[PDB]
Design a protein around this ligand. Sequence first.
Ligand SMILES: COP(=O)(O)[C@](C)(O)c1sc(CCOP(=O)(O)OP(=O)(O)O)c(C)[n+]1Cc1cnc(C)nc1N
Ligand SMILES: COP(=O)(O)[C@](C)(O)c1sc(CCOP(=O)(O)OP(=O)(O)O)c(C)[n+]1Cc1cnc(C)nc1N
Ligand SMILES: [Mg+2]
Ligand SMILES: [Mg+2]
Lengths: 801, 801
Amino acid sequence: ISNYINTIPVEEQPEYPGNLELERRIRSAIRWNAIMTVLRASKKDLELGGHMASFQSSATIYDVCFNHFFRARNEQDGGDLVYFQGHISPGVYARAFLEGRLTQEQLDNFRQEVHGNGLSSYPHPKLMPEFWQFPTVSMGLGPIGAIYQAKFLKYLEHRGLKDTSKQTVYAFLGDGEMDEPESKGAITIATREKLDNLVFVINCNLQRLDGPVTGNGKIINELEGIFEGAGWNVIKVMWGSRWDELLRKDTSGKLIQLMNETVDGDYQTFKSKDGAYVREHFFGKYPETAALVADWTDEQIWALNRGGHDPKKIYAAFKKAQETKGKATVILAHTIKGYGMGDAAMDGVRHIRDRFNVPVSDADIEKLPYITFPEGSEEHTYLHAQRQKLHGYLPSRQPNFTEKLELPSLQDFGALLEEQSKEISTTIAFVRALNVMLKNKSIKDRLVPIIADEARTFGMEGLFRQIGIYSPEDEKGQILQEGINELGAGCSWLAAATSYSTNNLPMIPFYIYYSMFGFQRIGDLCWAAGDQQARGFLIGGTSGRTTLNGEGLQHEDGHSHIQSLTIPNCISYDPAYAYEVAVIMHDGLERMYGEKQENVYYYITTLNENYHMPAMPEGAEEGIRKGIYKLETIEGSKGKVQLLGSGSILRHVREAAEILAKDYGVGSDVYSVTSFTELARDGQDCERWNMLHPLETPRVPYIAQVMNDAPAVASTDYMKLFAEQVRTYVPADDYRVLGTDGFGRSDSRENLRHHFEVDASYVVVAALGELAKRGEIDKKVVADAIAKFNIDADKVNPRLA
Amino acid sequence: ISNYINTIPVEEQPEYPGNLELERRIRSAIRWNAIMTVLRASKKDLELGGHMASFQSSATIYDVCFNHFFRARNEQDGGDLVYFQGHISPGVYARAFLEGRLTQEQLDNFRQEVHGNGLSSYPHPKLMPEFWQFPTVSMGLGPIGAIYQAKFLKYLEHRGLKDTSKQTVYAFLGDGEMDEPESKGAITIATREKLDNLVFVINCNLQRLDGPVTGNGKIINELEGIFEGAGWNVIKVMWGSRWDELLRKDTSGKLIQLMNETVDGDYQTFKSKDGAYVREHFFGKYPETAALVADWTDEQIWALNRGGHDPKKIYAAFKKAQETKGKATVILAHTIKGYGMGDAAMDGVRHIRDRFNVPVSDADIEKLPYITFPEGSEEHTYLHAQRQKLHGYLPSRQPNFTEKLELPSLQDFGALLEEQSKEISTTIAFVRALNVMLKNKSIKDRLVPIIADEARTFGMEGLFRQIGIYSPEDEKGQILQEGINELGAGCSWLAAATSYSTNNLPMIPFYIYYSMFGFQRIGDLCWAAGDQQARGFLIGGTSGRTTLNGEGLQHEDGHSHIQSLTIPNCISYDPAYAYEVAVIMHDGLERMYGEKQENVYYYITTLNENYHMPAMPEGAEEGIRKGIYKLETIEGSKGKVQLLGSGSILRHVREAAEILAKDYGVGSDVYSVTSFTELARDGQDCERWNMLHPLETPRVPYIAQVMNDAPAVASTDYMKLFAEQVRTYVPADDYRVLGTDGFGRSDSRENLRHHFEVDASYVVVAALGELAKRGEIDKKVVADAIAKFNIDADKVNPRLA
Ligand SMILES: COP(=O)(O)[C@](C)(O)c1sc(CCOP(=O)(O)OP(=O)(O)O)c(C)[n+]1Cc1cnc(C)nc1N
Ligand SMILES: COP(=O)(O)[C@](C)(O)c1sc(CCOP(=O)(O)OP(=O)(O)O)c(C)[n+]1Cc1cnc(C)nc1N
Ligand SMILES: [Mg+2]
Ligand SMILES: [Mg+2]
């Protein structure tokens, strides 16, 4: 911790390069337009919401950056990647309007987007695909997202894929937001990886929403203490220019002592009072500090301002950051929340128009008019001139990449479509599939395999040799080993998965990890990734409740597919065989990185269990993509059922089919369900459309074009809801679903599959019971199966075990 | 960052209080048994798994704590709260066996728990309720959980509820695990709250699972740097006692220097070579260093050990931690992963036996025998004596609290059961219910309201005047204000929700926050809370996709219920009315904290929208708790349907019922569904039971007892699956479900409810559609309803919008 004053003394401060007077004029119009946008919205009385106090506190910080630092996307790179603090969006909209990028109508449609000519409350690429870039309103994600984005830019340079040396990643953070663990939890990575292309800008207004961040402490010193300790370059922007003479003339050092000892709570109390109060309670603390302003008026004392509101102090900080190498920089900008808003914290607008000398008549002021600068005016000219010098306007977003990739054909995965020699797992199939992609000229080096420590568990260790591990194992290494850090790996994945948009350089990441620690652990990032239109693959390894058998409660995943189906643009699959994994990976590659450029990302659960991998049935490709296909039908003259399975449990459902046929004379149609969720969505879309077009030919759910009406049983390694979700669309009156509801526990696969009532025995009993209800076999046969199979009909429901 | 030597020089090192040689005899048996447990499991060839290398590196650290520090649960307090690193569990089981707390048959069932006499892979209270206390195997949750547990202990002392001053919270962490953002992201909280009852014990073996944490750096210095920066007391336990004469003998300071410049990777390299390669590639760096070991044998060099393996060095650290006040302490213990396992990390077993002088003869070694110390032996005597002086054995867990609470009756919530004069929301209902609880003598001071910054948004402000904010606004304050930190808040909620077990002191937490930032953001902690048998309330405020209308994509929650239903022991509700909220909160209170002591926690989504709140219908209580009740029946002669709604959307389904009756003569039964998830679980249980008891009369799902066969339509503020999950159990041929699938966006509630196709007009069209299909009405009237209601039949599916 250093003294509570500016890091950069005035004698080391560079001359300000812009026109302060003209800049303030434009900045005041932006402040005004932002407040008009939100006030106009609130007048509608539709609970639209919106904030003003935060942007008022950081407007000058953004202004200096827009006028002198921010590079826009250009022909060479995506420009500076700015993670705009979410709730200051009105200020960004206000500037964009001023630059003629948005119409008044749009501002008048702030927070009213459904009908198409409105603006989102916050940065949401999915809602405004040509405008916003990084979803930041869920606090804490921006900081860690920014760290891994800066690290990815370095990666692209080190790998010789793109020169990104001219890009800087700015993460605009709140001080209260720094309390989210995700906020400082990975700051150490920036020092490890020497991220001198990263600048954290923390708006230290000392307040969060309902009160001070740490009233009895000094948040700025806390921030400086931990960032410095983590090895970052810390630049404090504490006091404005009026304080300089004061600090210089004070030979006693008491003013510094006084600033050091005063806590946040008191500094906040001062700004809520007046000049006389500050003279008595702050300077009045010591005779020497009292003497420094004895000859000042109370009004002159009240003029003293925080550093984050002084363009000269701000510039000094951003320029210094720009020259700092070998590590990242954090700028702690001291501001006043609700700056210039008066008592507020219908003439409160009058106060604001007076305070910022806004050019709005006391006559028109009732109309909450927006201010624009006409073409040819000083303001208009300067505004655009500064932006053109920095390559244009930002934020801006390109929705599709321009180059054409020569993707592998499904035939290139031919080896995986044949029966496999040895028993292997779908995870081994995944690695084999990746190897096929790594032989493809067009995308081999665009692939970004990502792992969170665990590689050996996934048989990925065979790649540490072939393509190497990134380590600026050298800087040309291709694999990203992020350690025990799922959120960090997900942030690398996200940066890679959106490179097609931000850098017009499509990269195809495959992040494989323990499925349990996917959506459950980084779900807020998975949602944000959907918002950011990520295109990549999330491979949930060691998946299935009963399949990662020895690991237990906190590892046995029988529900990640329930979490993943809540993300609209995530496409999820639970393949049982190697050929399915290949057809799915190929399809995903084609949809996301082929000419379609579909904005979706994939989720594929894979397994750590080896078993026989048969050849793909001729023509089953499309059915695998759609979510289901008939594997075979076994004959039997005593009855007929339908049996569905997915993932590791399918082979057990097939075992049940053979038992039903040979022991009971019951034939069956056996289906592999590669994606219950895609089938459910398809069924939902068909019935929605049918409800809306009552006079037309009703659409038939895909699952109904595959299944028939005989009694059906489904079993998977996931909770029942995974397979039950398609009930409405299954065309049979009986559809029984077995699943792994309940907490996991350690045991053999055999014991867990019996415990969770999903093994072949339970599928047979479920099928026989349906026949028995139809009077096709004696109920005693079902009772006898239960006993023969050692099934305990009265053990507690696994959900409650 | 200090020199790469012990923080506590030998001159300030207290005399070790124990019998080193005897403790080693005991420790060697624990080491042996842990290994035997894992090897015997491996022999079964059931992919059970388990670890050995990690515990071998930290065994002595734990051993010193078990002999001289760890306080067991006693009559005064719950003892020290030890968050044992998850994968060192075999060592804990080995010691417990040696203490006679576990049997040999239990060790032989390591990782086979289904049949009842086994041991979980890791610390899972849900699976071993009388043994484990804290779920730590999901890395990163242990450290932040421990920080807030330590804070909660202080809270209990300041509130005057329990004297926890003698309790220390120990978090045993791995160095690789420190990369999890949750691991270091909340550490400044320990400094703000002066948590001198918290000790972080980081096993710095320089390795994670697939390689070194940071081979090109020095993870110990990185850790010291940031913890020191966060205000913690850092104690580095670097070198064993053999280095003391050496470090002192060096006058050039070349050794200190040599130690400072060597990177993690080099150090790991050395421990795989031998004294030879060490006296040359480490000591043979500077003539002054290689000269210190001039008169030394390559064997005496190879003898130099890391501090984490020397009990004298370990004791000093823990003793210094125990004495420290005003801040938390972190101990960085330098160890060797796979310590003493030689060759590897019957020949390897022979090596272990010899290396640690294990009392196992050549004749018995092939049987992989466990060792025990007979009563009367020195080892047995010492083992138990040390533990008795420390109040007993740990870990151990008490599943139920002993005191009897006098809970408020449902009558005490009478005002909430009546028709409300003022239009209010379910969130206002929750705050009022809390207030009722706050007037109950027995539980008023056991309630723990928790907020993450936002209180004003939730109308929680009126409570500050009543009970205040915990702020050591004073240390008697009842409300926990955790700032912008949902994970921290969840950890405080967990600490409070499990106080009933940990301190035999029931505390009832109510954590209210934006629902979107619940399971989605802290889902891994929620799962873990289930494992920890948490009994508390999670209130997802501002819930529903269309109800928090202006906030948009990262705020509009139409899926938290899909995430919460994956947790077995979480009970979820989405009430529409104030009376339902009171009935739900009363029942949860009774279930969890009444005599039943059910191990579940509640999740209730509440709304920010005000509307008319009717009186609870006579006798609806049981239906409200079970999940559904028939609100009303509307007469009609043209047809009849059933309409279901929950949350804020029920109001609209009720309006659709009026329209159906007024404009189309269609009558209906209207049901409020307070919990689609509890109904689906009930349905699954009935079907599971019916399948398992084919000779019995089929049980009928509650929802089917309540409903009839008339065409049904359901609408909610969540994705369709929320209501579709009960499809199988709805006894009607048609069950259409409207829901809010798709990303949220900003707009008026009216525009979003139309966009997401869940408003009254869509319910009416859905119902007419079913009647037309049945022939009751003409399809043409369905078509005319669509145009009449300004419904765009061809707009894109909201899931895709
Ligand atoms: C819906 O509007 P809101 O509640 O005002 C909003 C914008 O959603 C905010 S703003 C806010 C306080 C921000 O305080 P900071 O000091 O970080 O920023 P500022 O002082 O405003 O510059 C919080 C906690 N949240 C809520 C919040 C909480 N948790 C997460 C993960 N994200 C949030 N964004
Ligand atoms: C299946 O067992 P496993 O992989 O050996 C296990 C126990 O599951 C572990 S152990 C482990 C490495 C531990 O490294 P540390 O340096 O922290 O500890 P140690 O060196 O062993 O003392 C990881 C990443 N995981 C996996 C892991 C990853 N991510 C989370 C959130 N939790 C985990 N626990
Ligand atoms: Mg702030
Ligand atoms: Mg380690």
